[PDB]
Design a protein around this ligand. Sequence first.
Ligand SMILES: [Mn+2]
Length: 70
Amino acid sequence: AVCPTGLFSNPLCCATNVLDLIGVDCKTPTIAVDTGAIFQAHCASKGSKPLCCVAPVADQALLCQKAIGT
Ligand SMILES: [Mn+2]
C-alpha cells in the first residue's frame, strides 16, 4: 500500500504538508515505489514527506493526503 486509488493516487515526495491537505515542493520518486516503508524511506532520504497527490508530476503545490500510517 503506496497510495489509494482515485483522487489521491500519485506518490510524491514533498517538502511540506500544509494543513494535512497540501503538498509543497513536490518531487517525483527517483525509484519505483513498491511499499509504504520504501515510500517513507525514499522521501525521507530527500528531506521530504511521502504524500499521495492529485497529479503525478513535480510541482510547486498540490492537493495531497499523507501516506497511510504517517
Ligand atoms: Mn516552492
